[PDB]
């Protein structure tokens, strides 16, 4: 019955999104969420919902929601879905098998690219073992790809575990930056639900 708008404005319209390997997470609570404005925006390239169908989100009440945001390459978007495998779904950001939420993505080629090449976006490439769902790894220790221990210094068979996307305004549509926001619902006194 409380009447205050959810801060959906700042999440989607933030000036800076973090790298895929250090994705942000935000709690939204004690507010009424109007999901109609998002859907009829036509500014989103992809709006896919698992376990819950849109156009009914204005009903239903949730315990608490989650907003995960980052930026990745345009082609790699299809890896953000349950049961998918790849570099992103193994070493960077993995979704559980029982996901109940929606995935929103839209092209951002005119904000995240620079003339000289943007090297401020990175992604993890090597890891000893795959990730568990919703687990984040931030460390930057040197990966040991061979029999000879590296002892914390890089060299032959001692690779740095992070690599740069290198976005540019002239890249193909498959290699352009895309912004992604993942909403997770959990279905306790419900606090967030629309009018």
């Amino acid at each position, epitope marked *: 019955n409380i009447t205050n708008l959810c801060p959906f404005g700042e999440v989607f319209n933030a000036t800076r999104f973090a790298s895929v390997y250090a994705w942000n997470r935000k709690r939204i609570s004690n507010c009424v969420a109007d999901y109609s404005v998002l859907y009829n925006s036509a500014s989103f390239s992809t709006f896919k919902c698992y376990g819950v169908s849109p156009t009914k989100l204005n009903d239903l009440c949730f315990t608490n929601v989650y907003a995960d945001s980052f930026v990745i390459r345009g082609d790699e978007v299809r890896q953000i879905a349950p049961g998918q495998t790849g570099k992103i779904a193994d070493y960077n950001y993995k979704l559980p098998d029982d996901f109940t939420g929606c995935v929103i993505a839209w092209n951002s080629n005119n904000l995240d690219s620079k003339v000289g090449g943007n090297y401020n976006y990175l992604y993890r490439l090597f890891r000893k073992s795959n990730l568990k769902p919703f687990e984040r790894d931030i460390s930057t220790e040197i990966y040991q790809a061979g029999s000879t221990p590296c002892n914390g210094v890089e060299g*032959f068979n001692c690779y740095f575990p992070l*690599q740069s996307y290198g976005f*540019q305004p002239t890249n193909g549509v498959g290699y352009q930056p895309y912004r992604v926001v993942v909403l997770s619902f959990e279905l306790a006194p419900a606090t967030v639900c629309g009018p």
Partner: single-chain antibody
Amino acid sequence: IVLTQSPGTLSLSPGERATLSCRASQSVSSTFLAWYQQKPGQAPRLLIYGASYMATGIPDRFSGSGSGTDFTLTISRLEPEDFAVYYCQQYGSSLTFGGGTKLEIKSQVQLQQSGPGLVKPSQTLSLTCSISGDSVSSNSAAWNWIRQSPSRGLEWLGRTYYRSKWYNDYAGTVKSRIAINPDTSKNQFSLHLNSVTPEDTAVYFCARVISVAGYAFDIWGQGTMVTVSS
């Protein structure tokens, strides 16, 4: 690991496509293949690192693909200025270049080289590579030395860098008689060879490598030729 350039030589016309091929002796788990284009009389230029990602100020005609033991480069629409040579470089447990294909048709950081160009046989050779626009003791860079001769192609000599202290590496062929010395006071690095032989006649370049950019030779030097003769 040995890289073999599959197409020998191609002759095309303006407008259509071109297709290259690079083959690895065994699997490259590091996946750090890079493609370089060299015009005559000029230092090589970087095109693609990571086998797919574009470099700085490069049009969209060039495309890269491949994985495992094979790789390919594709040119969408040729231009009369594409009279050049194209190489194929890898990194991992070893650093090796490729033979390369000759194709014929019908900026904020600078490296400057200095040193003598002629030396008496059985003497010492000294070269220096001054840096403008960066600090030689950077945390995320390495400084290399490359040399080229027509009989052997492009050859890797040695490298130096600094993470907590100074670290050096050298190629097995030249281990016994090579030295690399940095100097932070005047921000340079120099190469020394105590003994020289007639076959050493070659053209030398100094190059910078950034670890987050696929270990690709980003910025090259002017390069100078050295001839060993009486």
